[PDB]
Amino acid sequence: TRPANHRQLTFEEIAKSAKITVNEVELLVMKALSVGLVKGSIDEVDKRVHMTWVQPRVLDLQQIKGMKDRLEFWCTDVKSMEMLVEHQAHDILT
Amino acid sequence: MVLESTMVCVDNSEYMRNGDFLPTRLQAQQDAVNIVCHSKTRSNPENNVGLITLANDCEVLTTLTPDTGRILSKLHTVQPKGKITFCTGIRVAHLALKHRQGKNHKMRIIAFVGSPVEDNEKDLVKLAKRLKKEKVNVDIINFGEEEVNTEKLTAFVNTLNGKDGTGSHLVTVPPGPSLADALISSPILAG
Amino acid sequence: AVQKVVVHPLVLLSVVDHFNRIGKVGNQKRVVGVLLGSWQKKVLDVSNSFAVPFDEDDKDDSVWFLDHDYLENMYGMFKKVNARERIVGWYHTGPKLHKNDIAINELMKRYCPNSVLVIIDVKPKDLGLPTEAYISVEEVHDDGTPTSKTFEHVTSEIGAEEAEEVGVEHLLRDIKDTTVGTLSQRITNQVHGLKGLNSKLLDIRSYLEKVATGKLPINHQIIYQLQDVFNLLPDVSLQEFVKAFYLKTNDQMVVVYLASLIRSVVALHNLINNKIANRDAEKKEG
Amino acid sequence: QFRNKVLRVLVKIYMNLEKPDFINVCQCLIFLDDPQAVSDILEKLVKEDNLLMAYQICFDLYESASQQFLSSVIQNLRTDQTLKMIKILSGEMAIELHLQFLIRNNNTDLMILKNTKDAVRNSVCHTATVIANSFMHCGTTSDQFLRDNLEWLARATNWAKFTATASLGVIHKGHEKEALQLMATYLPKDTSPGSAYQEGGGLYALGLIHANHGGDIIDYLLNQLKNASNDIVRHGGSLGLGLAAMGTARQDVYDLLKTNLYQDDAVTGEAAGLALGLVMLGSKNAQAIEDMVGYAQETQHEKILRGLAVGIALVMYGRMEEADALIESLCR
Amino acid sequence: PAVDTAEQVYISSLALLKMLKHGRAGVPMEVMGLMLGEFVDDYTVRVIDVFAMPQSGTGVSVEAVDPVFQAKMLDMLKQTGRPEMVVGWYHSHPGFGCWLSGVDINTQQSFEALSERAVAVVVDPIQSVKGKVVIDAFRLINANHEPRQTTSNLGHLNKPSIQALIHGLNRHYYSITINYRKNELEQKMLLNLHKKSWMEGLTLQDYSEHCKHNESVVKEMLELAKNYNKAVEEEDKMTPEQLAIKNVGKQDPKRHLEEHVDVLMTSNIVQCLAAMLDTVVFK
């Protein structure tokens, strides 16, 4: 659920969501990592977990359309840069 | 004397287990295609004959080859299994004898239907008209006697040779335990 | 398992010739044939090929015919002419995989157990290599359950011997532009790479549009791979990444600046020499 | 566009004068491509007693105006002086006068040709010296060199004989008074029969004699080409017919040449393409361009391709910026 | 009755590559094969394909061992869509240039007797280099006059080689121009051969290795600059002739500095531009 740019959960949040005390959060996250559900690290000093990859899941058509929109943005950026390079270097590449 | 590229469509279906027609319909049909291949070779030394099975979907065993030893040898290990797909088999045979070695040769298909055909009348007549346009003759043997009648086959042959074409044939053999080679006399001589 | 397939230019040009001749004959869309070659410990090498009679019904994906007797005869003759080449796979010019390809591959596996399919697009409306290599593999699912025979991609590249390279370079007097410098390093990449990436993303977008509207059903594996891609997309606003990027850019520009200074000094040297020569020549002529 | 406007203003200024400069006005009108004005001016001059103006103007028009421009001025006039003027625009008088001038002033040194003939040692130089003689005597009606060196000319064979026969037409440039019998005498019937090269050269020579000025020769060559059987004869006839009909978009000639082209023969095809270009010269006929370019892209004969390559450029003659699309496509 | 000099032999890309590959494979011998094609007009002899045949011989001669193979190959190619029949033969002369010997002339005589316009093609593999391929087409002259008629300049554009002239060119045989007409698909495939994958273009280059290479080249440029300073002090105490031989067996600091500058500029500019392009494209 968390967006890719933050994707940095905290011990209290995990405890509240999973109905377990803050102490067991580390063991829960380590079990997840060991099994292979999520990938990341644990920073006890700052009391945070940096999740970098969660297992793929089945998505509905609304989420597929969201992925399509994101692809549209990505393709627009690619085309913009291609046009920039072509226009600026037309002199050397004709 | 007439050049002819004749592809044989043999039926290795599960109804060939039946022993009604001599020592198993498989062996009866083996002898039948033996006599037919020998007859074609004797009729013309340059004549070329091949082999196709009408198993679950289809299988081409020996494309047009002037010799018959390879065809007969491959005929062994034709153990029966599966259903019969008449339309697909005949289409594959049509393609194979469209890709002939010699284009002056004529085109023929000898089919051994020893099992019911599940193709409707409309598809079979459509195939008949297509083959008539492409100038193919289809000699059909109503082997097996699973219906021993115009089991959507007389319509096929009549559509083929319509308007006094007298090119195709339909020899229907009774379950009489008489060698299928002994029974066949129309296509071999009076073709 | 194949790690790479090397397709020599003669194979490609022979495929083109086969396609052209069958097309001149008429009434055909795809061409098929055999790929003779050799093995180099998981690095294939396709060196030669020969045509094979082949026909198919444009409606039924189950009425197709391949003359394996002719295949065997021509393979015997090719072996008699060059022993070191043995059947390795089959090729077809169809723009994309057809549904009869697994059946044809099963037929050819009786001549080469590790048969490799190579699709050669003789009319490439794209920007990339013309060869795509596939190997038949059994796929075991978790919900798709029945294990089907699917085609798995294998890296394909074009290599050449010395004679083939010489011949291709001689024939390449159509449009020759080497310019190995920054010009080629800007055209062969950058522009080409961005265009190809846009093409692939457009293909993904078209498939996603079809899925969302409802023309095609959902493929959980494709959706999972797309999730992985979008996860891999990096973030370029991180302070650490920005700082590292600036550091490396500064180093590269240091080297560039030193090179430009060397260039300027050399240019000045040339100007001084030229002026000396011209002044001396004028003095001597006077 | 601005040049045309300025030329129109100049024409108006010429008109509004005590003694208008009708000659310069006709030049500017040729530039503007307005045969109506020149026809009107000629009509006014005849209505007056300025036959000298009329004759000089018509001479200048024939000498420096296009055939379509001349034809319109000959159709506007039509719909004793008028017959005389039209005979000037039709070009008969000018051709005859030039022929007379060249016949009378015919200073040419035959010693140089004799030296070249003696030095000749191969077929290439033989055909070269035949061509050089034709160039030297173009329009002079004289064939003394060929007449005296008859046994030396017989060495030429094949296309050398073709060129040798066409040299006669080159020499007799404009000698249209009696060309049919003049060529028949050189190419006698039932005399050494079986020289397709000679017959084709004769047709080519008639075309060269009547170059840019056809008439009955167009129809004669059309019939001869239709009845032709040998490829050499067809090639010579195509070249001659193209030269005769040069500039006149005659659909019958175009269709006959197109059929000869589609016959798909190299020797016939080259001449057919060149003749199509010559016939539909200047005109931007989309049909002609389409047919020629399509056949160039469809044929498998480099000779036909060469002929059509010249023909297309001839077709697009004159048109400055109307040729951009074709130029770009052909270059690509 | 002419045989003109504007006649050309059209060799397909496939035929040329097959010929060169077989010839190079048989480097010491004169390996040989047949050419299939059509006789289009009197100004074209189209060669569309060639196939080698079973042959055996020494470094002084090569001969075919079976004709059954040739017949069967012709039939089995016709069956797959190549009805073209033999129009000549090709064999390789490894390093002797292009010409025909006595045995070659006898073979060409047999081929001429069969078909009037049959041609022989000699391809020399080892003398061929990347840009150019040494290949020529030949036909014989009877015991007569001039062998051919010239109706154009196309024939006289090749300047026959001294070796061919010594070995009998224009006396026992004459050459025919070779042309390489191609179709659209052949052109496109030849152009596409060298095209690389798109990802290779955007792929970056290990920064450790890149920095190491930059460091190495700059360190080299330092010594080159020392030597350049030393060399600049010369070129005034040097004879106008002595300058040319001054750079024989001795390094040229100016040239090496220019080369290093070019390589460094290309590498660094490409890397920076690729880095920026990726920075934008990938989020």
Ligand SMILES: [Zn+2]
């Ligand atoms: Zn030799």
